[PDB]
Amino acid sequence: SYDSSSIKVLKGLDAVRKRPGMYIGDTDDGTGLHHMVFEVVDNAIDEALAGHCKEIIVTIHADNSVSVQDDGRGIPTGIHPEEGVSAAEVIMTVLHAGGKFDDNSYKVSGGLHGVGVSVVNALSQKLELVIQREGKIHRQIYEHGVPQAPLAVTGETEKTGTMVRFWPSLETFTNVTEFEYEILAKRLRELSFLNSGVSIRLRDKRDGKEDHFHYEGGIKAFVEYLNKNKTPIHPNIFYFSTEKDGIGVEVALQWNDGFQENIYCFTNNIPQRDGGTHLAGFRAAMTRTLNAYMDKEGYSSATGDDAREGLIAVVSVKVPDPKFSSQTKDKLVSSEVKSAVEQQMNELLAEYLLENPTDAKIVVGKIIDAARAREAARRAREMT
Template sequence: MAQTLPLQTSNNANTAAPRAAAAAARKGKTVEETYQKKSQLEHILLRPDTYIGSVEKHTQALWVYDGDEMVHRPVTYVPGLYKIFDEILVNAADNKQRDPRMDSVKVTIDPERNLISVYNNGDGVPVEMHREENVYVPELIFGHLLTSSNYDDTVRKTTGGRNGYGAKLTNIFSTEFVIETADGKNGLKYKQVFSKNMGVKGAPDIKACKAGENWTKVSFKPDLAKFNMTQLEDDVVALMKKRVIDLAGCLGKTVKVELNGKRVPVKTFADYVGLCLKFASKNRPEGSLPRIEETVNERWEVCVSLSEGQFQQVSFVNGIATIKGGTHVDHVTNQIANHVMTVVNKKNKTANLKAHNVKSHLWVFVNALIDNPAFDSQTKETLTLRQSSFGSKCELSDKFLQKVAKSGIVDSLLSWANFKQSKDLKKTDGSKRENLRGIPKLEDANDAGGRNSDKCTLILTEGDSAKALAVSAGT
């Protein structure tokens, strides 16, 4: 008796697999060549966009650190290369949360040698053998995928790491990767060299160190061929330097940040914002942009300035640059927009302003520490964590909101509202119409613009109550 197959469609796997195999056979491929299983490391190298973003060149307007100043200009860069640098930088920032005594970060970017290194002091990686995995902890953290100290979600952490990829991705996309750490607690210093995209692991070199010696240094040579590059190009270097400036602004005055042997000119988040506004104010006829700042608490720093016609934001979560914003930016911006909207609508009752109108005139800077942050992807460009899970609140003070309202944004919005109303009225000029629409608080005469328009009366009142009285009297 013939075997009965289930009902099938043209998309059913029962027909798709044999057809694919047949097609492969016609092309000279075996079944084994057609259907392949990859290791996770092979998959990362084969499909890098899933893990580090695109490995093709992109051009877009971004902030960079160029010629000792912050500049906003078109930049051609490879997102994946930028990401593997960022992973190591965020690791250094994370150590400040683990050990508040950390007070030094040193970054070296050497395009000629294609060599990048990031050093931080503070507690080093434990130089101990992991009993379950039978490898030293530094090798486990930097040379084995899906290893992390951030998996326990019952523990609230304000670090950037989360998914167990991080520095391993940098290792995988490097021709050489070196981890060095001093563990003063155990009195041991550790060094290990990885090469060929984490495919070759050198034996650890372990020596004694002083009891108070604690630091970590990661050095790597990006595999430029994986990014279709032959050298670290100027735009990429300028973008990397900007991330070092970011780090200095996020960590604040308790951490000395050095770039290529020189301390960067940023000690606070306010300094960082100042660099951005200095560039934006260069060709502004009205002079420097206003700056209203508030350190809300130990986890939130906010600054507001003006934008013209388009909302702008520069934000960070646990040292990560959230270039597309997210729920932390919404949390701050909504408070500001609601306050300003109320002020403007009181001054001009016909303005009928909405929150999005206010936001288009705002430039918001946010530096936040968030518990166990969740992002849209491994590239971490957008925070998606719900506000209720932040682990802290950012309640802007009345004093701060009042300063924002007096910064010039209210005047800008009033001018914009008046212009918009004037523009709406001009739409009716030069021709008769049956009805007028879209003008707040206008009650049009139904016969206006028609054959009985001579029987209509134009009534102007000041205030809603006067309007109600006039309309009732007229009827």
């Protein structure tokens, strides 16, 4: 019998536990498990983007929990009048709740859905929250998303910051249930490059391993790092950072003598594994600008794929209200970012090629060689 009693409304965090895939991704291969950490880290990075956090400490504990401490402003603790509990508890227990729906608290933030840490909470057997704010230490414990007691003051402090420690629920996560140091370290190293001036520490209490990431030089240095064990073919890394029409665009790139393409795209410091409009704009400007240069200098018919071979690039955009296809933010679907990146790249890459004739000549050589190899592969295929 199909009638009004067949219709169910899921309340609070029940939807997250019921359908974890739409909130955290794959709960079996480890990627969802580590995403729990990255949600908490993204909130600390957002305090760093806002200018308030200079140190982040990520700890893998020996009982398979993870903690993240930041020295930012602290999650607000005052009573939220509408809901009648502390703003921190609203944040931990209510979907689509937070301080990133306008630009008053965070001008630019990776966060935008009001869901992230509420997901972490919902999918954790236990979560510990410690907040340092307004001279006071506040603490609260959750079990499966349920607060055990109201947020309470436990003492005094000169400091500000937020600490979240969580133990993931094995009723949700299967197969890969332990944290992998190198997965966390990769992401934290990249965040250090993206956030100059912010100390990021990683500690593993299982084995005593630790890292301290504090690179200077930003994404230009990130490109150097990524070519470290490769062989760059030209010495001058192309780089710019601009802020035009409400949108920050920062690009670095360099070709090496290998045959792979590795472009890393980020929006408000969140990676897009599956690319998006920023990558589409980057590719479009590279193809245009190189073809124009080869035409003006008399070297020209290669395509956009021949520009790929040997490329390492980082594209990092800063956007007031970006649009992603999912909570995991694997893909950027904001059309005006395609145009901002394309426009800035066309102008600054053309200047780069004019100002660095030796590099330009080497890169043209590489593109031509890629095209020559592509055409020979094709003829060889046809002939078998």
